[PDB]
Structure formats: structure tokens, C-alpha cells
Design a protein around this nucleic acid. Structure first.
Ligand code: CA
Ligand code: CA
Lengths: 440, 445
DNA sequence: TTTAATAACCCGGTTATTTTT
DNA sequence: AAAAATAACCGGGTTATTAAA
């Protein structure tokens, strides 16, 4: 009884599309024209108050020719034993089943000859096979299809809901209450929800994501959702850059609005993880067709029980994202001396030798969407705008000046930064994580 | 020059309001009718196409009487320097400025005889003194106020912008870009902004915040706000749209408290309640803004101990000293806890956990004016006065003899496991206790 | 013979004490 | 007589080795 797919041929934006469905469907995307045409395709198939006006000239493909519109719904009916809705659809259809063991049923909408009397005319045919479809019998204004289904449309009998953007002029907690009410109540068994707000999509289970695109053909991507608050604003994006901390984010929001400031309208997003852990995020983004991009920094860690033996932490966190094996450990000797500045200067010079030692493995990290820095953000930020960093802080060592307060000295660099400097950050050879987010 | 105040007297919701407002005014609250009526009071004061129809019967306070509606605006006139609006405002007037050393200017709005042929007969007067105001002169349909000020209204010469709900049919990143165009650049200098959106208040500085109260007296709280302001305003921007705010340190007591405030009072966000994450024990960054806007700043803390850097065995008293730093008082002295080297771990944790009760029952006089104000201090942490409420049900779920040791290892991963299997009576058990009296003051019961 | 309990590191904050110049 | 590390806690996360019953 759970709906298999819909085939739309010659409608107002479509040429040949086959959108897989189930119950509880969510439609999003960039263009609103394809989302309105998807819900009006369901309204022309299953609602009589749109279907009684017929088709206009604008309801065909573009505005002229290809004068044969099919909208076909395929239900995947099968045997659900004594069921409330399935035995109802056995009971009203009756004689249009060609066999008693058929596990599929078709509802087809045909339209032809727009050019004669300026009128579309819509013919609805039942049938469990693609050949020998039987016409739906009706006496007056009422078909026998209208005894089965009922369509309720929301915009600011098996019941189908069609909801278009309920986030307009409501509070966000009312969107959270609508988000729980769409998935715990059994009266919202079948819907098609069009939305932009992330608060309607916090809790979500067993849901076909239908993504429409900005192309003129409009192709649709259809994905199953089975089982989070950070991912809800990243559900509406195709490309997600996964970054570690807020100091990365303030720099990237200053660069990405001074180079290409409409990146999130095109479908890019900046996602925080709050640490160095990406494997809980990339399995969620991989199942939903969202292209993750990972930016992380190379780190070293001292080993417990051994003095001088250091383990390769930032390399192994990219090897565990690929399912690979860990590396063997290194040995650094460090004297007593002072451990404030000089110990960090030994540990930078070891990590550069590591980063040139495993450069062909950095290459197969970068063949996937994992980008690993040489040391940190603050040291390859110094490799681009290091002539501009000494003027702002009035200091000889600006990396050590950012090392004291990582975010508070970052926002003083952000608040005094020129327009040409963001191109120098963005066009660097080591800031290539940004170039895969914008898609250029 | 800058705006100084408006005084609205007998208009359609107000009885006597003296609203002190600077430039770049931001208007918010749960009274959308009062925000709409405040912008209509500015349109009857300063716009031509609203004032040419006059007052109807509906904007005579409630529906009747109130026979003298006075709307008086003061702009105080004394900045000059490179801004020529002082020179325009003193060049258009002739005899309203009687003395050239005066530092106040009055634009007054009057109306009378409300029951004569259903017309307001709006009269506009100028003057630098409150007594003997002169009449604003005009020839035909155009006053002398009309040649000075121009009003542009947005709803989906000296320029005044009146913007009403711009988040309708506007995308979220363009709301953030509209906040950046409102407050960083100098394009809009005089505006009044009404909104319901948290993302128009991210980048804001040097602005007057007007909070409209939910009561029927429609009084307002106006705050001069000057300032990492992104890290402050990202948390604070959804908290300003809330009348009462609970300040919590961690995401364990968002997951714990949102289950309880959906089982007991699930419409608590619709009456002016909010839960504010801090991410640590730093509440002095957040209480400076909420107290000046009339928002109650409710705070739940835990007692903490720290070993000192130089001496061994003595303990800095960080549980009470973070609560006195909001109250500005002098810090406490030092205590001595004798812990040997071969005790470390669970025994060391319970040996410090006894001494956090021993410092708390000693200092019950000191915590009386903590809880008399909106600062709440726990016994040890969240998970022992949570065990003093639902502790028979803590041992049911984890299949553990001592579940508070089982919960400190995990934090969120067994806090979520606790919150998913909570019964209905359990969320009234935890809401009722006197150590969870911070939850009552958020909802007022 | 498994099993929890810290060393080590990452993403943010504070406040008093050495420390070095 | 300062100002810059450095303990030592607070809100979150992951491996890996050790002590531990
Ligand atoms: Ca890093
Ligand atoms: Ca705590």
C-alpha cells in the first residue's frame, strides 16, 4: 500500500521523469517552480477541484507541442492481509484487476488535443497492467477514483496531504511542534511536504528525500531516510565543508562573502564538528547524496609509557576515514630546556618532514575529499598572507600571537582585513578545500 | 544629531508613554499589535499620506473619550560638526528657535473635538520651548514639516525608514546579509525595525533595543546597546525574543530539561521561556544584556573545587566565587582537604564530594541571597540532586547498583539513554523538588 | 582475563600563581 | 615591576596503554 513511484511525462517542466516515493515524502530544492509543479501534478492526478477546470495552454510542456500528457501513479499494492486501506482499494476497484495474484496497480492520467476548442480534457484509467487499462466509470461529475482518495492542500477514504511551506509567519517552536506532529500522529500517514526551514526537519524517519535541481529539464534525486540537530541545516545543501572549530568558520565566512557571497544559494554549507571527528557525519551525508568535504590539521601525540616516541594522530584520523591501516610511530628527542616556544618549534619541523615523507598518501587523501594541512590553520595562513599579518598585529611573530587566543585574535584579523586579501587566501594552493565547496 | 525621545499620550493603545529612543531603533516583543501601533504613531507624526486622512474613531485611546492626543518628539538639535541636519532644521524654522543656545527642539502633534463629524483635525506645532509653541506654517496641502522629513515604509531631506516584518519571503542568508547592511554600513541612519526573526540581530551594535511587554499597559523597556560579539549574539539573539531566560552550562541539561518541559508545560516557549546554552561556567558575558532589557536571567550552577598551583593540599573555592563575581562581592578564603597520594579515582571523587556538602551546609547563610536572586547553586553537580529526585528510577534503567558513577563516564551518551526511557510521573517527580526550583521560575508556577 | 581509569590530544572559556626579563 | 606562560578547573569528543578486580 506504500506508494512505489510516479511517472510524469509531458507536464509543465518535465520531459520524462520517474520519481520513486514512499509514504511520508519530503520535497526540497533550489527552484520553487518545480516544487509547485510537483504538487500541482499530484493535484491534477488526485484532486477533482483542480481537475474539473482541465488543462490550459500553459499546462503542457513549455507552451506548445508534445500533445500527450501522462501522469502515472504506481502503488505497489501486494498482499497486506486484512488491511484497512488495501481491502478498501480491493473493494472499490472490483473488476479492473486482471488477476487475483497481481501485486501492482496503476492509475494513469492521459491528456490530448489541446488545440481543439482550447481545452485540455483529462482521462483517468485504472489498471493492474500497462496494457488493457480500464477506464474509471462515473455517472456525473464524480469518478470512481474519488471514492478511494481524498486530497487536503495546505498553503499559508485514503487521505493524502500536500503541504507547501508552513514556516511562513509561525514561531520556531511551533515548527518544532509541527515537526513532531508530522511523524508521531497516524493521521499524517501520506504527505508530500515542501519546506525551507530546518526546524521542521529535526526528527525524521523512513522518508523519501526528493531533491529538485535548477536545470531546465529538472531531474529529481530520490533517497530513503532511515535512522542530528547540526545536520538539519545541512540537509538542504549538496556540498558541505566539514571544519573543526569556530576560528576556521569566522575566517571562511569573511573570505566567502568577499569572493563569492551567494555560495549558500548555490548549495554550499559550512558545518562544525566541534573537535576532530568526522566519521559520525560522513556516514549520514554519504547515505543522502550530499558531498562532504573534510578539512583537518596534522597533529602529533605523545605515547603513554614511552618517552620520546610520538604517534601520528592526524594522519591516522584520515586513514580511519578510508578504512585503512594505521602507520608506525616516530622518535623525537627533546631536552629539558624551555618548553614554551622551542618545543613547538621542534614539533613543527618534525611534522613538515612527516608531511613531505607521506606526500603520495596525502595525494590519495586528496583524491577523496579529505584535505590535511601541513601543521595547522595558522601556519598555512601564514604561508599566504604573512606579509599582511605583521601590519595588523604590529608584531614580528603573528602565528605565536594567534596561538595565545585562537578566536579573539582571529576576529581582530577578520575585523581589519582588506578586500584583495581574501582572494590571496582563496586562490592559494593549500586552501583548495574552499574551491571544492563553491564548485568552480 | 540624534533622536532623543517620543512622548505618546492618548493614541490607540497608549495612555502615557515617554519612550527614550536613540537612532537605529530595534523593536521586538510578543505584542505585535503594539509594534504595529508604534510604527503607525510614527506615520501619523511624520508621514503625509497617513496624516491627510486624520484620526478615525478607532484611534481615540480605546474607542471613546480621550479628547487631546499629544504626540511630542524631541531631537535635541546639538551636534552640527560635519552633519548639516542641524543647519537644515534651524534654517527651515524662523521663530520656533527663540534662542540660539537652546539644546532641545519639540515637534508636537495635537487633536481635539473627537465627536464632531468623525474627524480628528490634526494640528502640528513647532517650538524650542514647551510652552508657547508656534504653529507649523503651510500654504496649501504642504506643511513646513513636509519639506524637512521623508518617511519610507517597508512591509511585504531627512530620511526615516520604517521596516515591518522583513523576514516574510526572505531567505535566511539574506536575513544575515540584511542585518549586515542594517548595522555595519552607514546607509540607513534613522530607522525603526520591527521583526520576529533571530537572524536579523546577529551583527548589531550601537543600537537602541525596545522590548514591548506582553501586558495590556503596553509599556516598553528601551536599552542603549553597545559592544567576540558574534559568539555573544548567536546565543543571545534567540534569547532576546524571550521574556524569561534559563542559563545552563551544558548540553546534558538541555536534553534533560527539554523532556521535562515538554511533559509538564509543553507550551512554555509560547509564554516567554527560553533555555540558553553557555558552554561553560561564564555567565557574566550574558547577564549584562538581559537585565537592562527586562529579561529575568535565571542561572543554575554547580559547586566546584580546584587545587591551587603553588601550595599542595589547599583548595580554591570556585563554586561560590563564581556566584559572588556576579554580585561583585569579595572572594572567600581557602580550605584544607587532606588527600594522600595512594587514594586516587573513585575514592578521591567521593572524598571531594563529601567536602562539597561540608562547604555548602557551612555556608547556608551565603546561599540565601544567592537563591533570593536568580542564581542557583547545586549540592555537588546536576547528577546528585537528580539522584535525590528520580534515584529509584535511575537504578531501574541502567541495571546498575551505583548509577551516578555510571553516568559520569558517559555524560550525553547515557543522558540520551536516560531521557528516551522516562515515564510520565518521573518528569513531575523531578519538576517538584526544591533543588529544581530554577525550572519553576522559568515558567512562573 | 577482561575491564574501567586515566595519559595524551582536539574544539571553546576563566583566574590565580610562578617566571623571566 | 611588569607581562607572558602554566596549572587547573569548566562545557563537549577519541584512541590506547595501564592498573585492577
Ligand atoms: Ca587543529
Ligand atoms: Ca558542572
Amino acid at each position: 500500500m506504500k506508494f512505489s513511484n510516479i511517472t510524469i511525462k509531458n507536464f509543465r517542466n518535465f520531459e520524462k521523469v520517474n520519481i520513486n516515493l514512499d509514504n511520508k515524502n519530503v520535497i526540497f530544492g533550489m527552484n520553487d517552480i518545480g516544487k509547485t509543479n510537483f504538487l500541482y501534478a499530484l493535484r491534477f492526478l488526485l484532486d477533482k477541484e483542480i481537475r474539473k477546470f482541465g488543462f490550459n495552454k500553459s499546462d503542457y510542456h513549455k507552451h506548445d507541442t508534445s500533445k500527450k500528457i501522462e501522469i502515472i501513479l504506481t502503488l505497489d499494492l501486494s498482499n497486506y492481509e486484512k488491511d484497512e486501506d488495501t481491502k478498501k482499494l480491493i473493494s472499490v476497484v472490483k473488476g479492473a484487476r486482471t488477476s487475483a495474484n497481481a501485486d501492482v496497480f496503476y492509475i494513469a492520467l492521459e491528456s490530448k488535443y489541446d488545440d481543439k476548442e482550447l481545452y485540455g480534457n483529462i482521462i483517468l484509467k485504472w489498471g493492474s497492467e500497462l496494457d488493457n487499462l480500464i477506464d474509471i466509470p462515473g455517472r456525473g461529475n464524480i469518478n470512481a477514483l474519488d471514492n478511494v482518495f481524498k486530497v487536503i492542500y495546505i498553503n499559508p477514504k485514503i487521505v493524502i496531504y500536500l503541504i507547501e511551506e508552513p514556516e511562513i509567519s509561525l514561531h520556531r517552536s511551533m515548527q518544532i511542534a509541527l515537526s513532531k506532529q508530522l511523524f508521531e500522529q497516524s493521521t499524517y500517514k501520506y504527505f508530500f511536504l515542501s519546506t525551507h526551514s530546518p526546524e521542521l526537519l529535526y526528527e525524521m524517519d523512513n522518508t523519501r528525500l526528493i531533491r529538485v535541481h535548477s536545470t531546465e529539464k529538472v531531474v529529481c534525486s530520490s533517497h530513503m531516510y532511515n535512522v542530528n540537530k547540526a545536520l538539519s541545516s545541512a540537509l538542504f545543501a549538496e556540498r558541505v565543508l566539514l571544519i573543526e572549530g569556530p576560528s576556521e568558520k569566522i575566517l571562511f565566512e569573511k573570505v566567502l562573502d568577499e569572493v563569492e557571497p551567494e555560495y549558500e544559494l548555490n548549495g554550499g554549507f559550512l558545518l562544525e564538528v566541534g573537535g576532530t571527528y568526522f566519521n559520525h557525519y560522513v556516514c549520514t551525508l554519504n547515505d543522502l547524496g550530499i558531498t562532504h568535504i573534510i578539512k583537518t590539521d596534522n597533529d602529533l601525540k605523545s605515547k603513554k609509557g614511552k618517552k620520546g616516541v610520538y604517534e601520528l594522530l592526524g594522519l591516522n584520523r584520515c586513514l580511519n576515514l578510508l578504512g585503512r591501516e594505521n602507520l608506525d610511530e616516530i622518535t623525537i628527542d627533546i631536552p629539558e630546556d624551555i618548553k614554551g616556544k622551542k618545543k613547538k618549534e621542534r614539533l613543527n619541523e618534525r611534522k613538515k618532514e612527516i608531511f613531505k615523507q607521506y606526500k603520495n598518501e596525502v595525494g590519495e587523501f586528496l583524491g577523496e575529499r579529505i584535505y590535511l594541512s601541513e601543521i595547522d590553520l595558522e601556519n598555512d595562513l601564514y604561508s599566504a598572507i604573512g606579509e599582511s599579518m605583521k601590519r595588523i598585529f604590529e608584531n614580528e611573530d603573528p602565528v605565536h600571537y594567534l596561538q595565545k587566543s585562537k578566536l579573539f585574535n582571529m576576529v581582530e584579523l577578520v575585523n581589519n582585513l582588506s578586500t584583495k586579501d581574501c582572494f590571496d587566501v582563496f586562490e592559494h594552493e593549500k586552501f583548495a578545500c574552499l574551491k571544492e565547496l563553491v564548485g568552480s
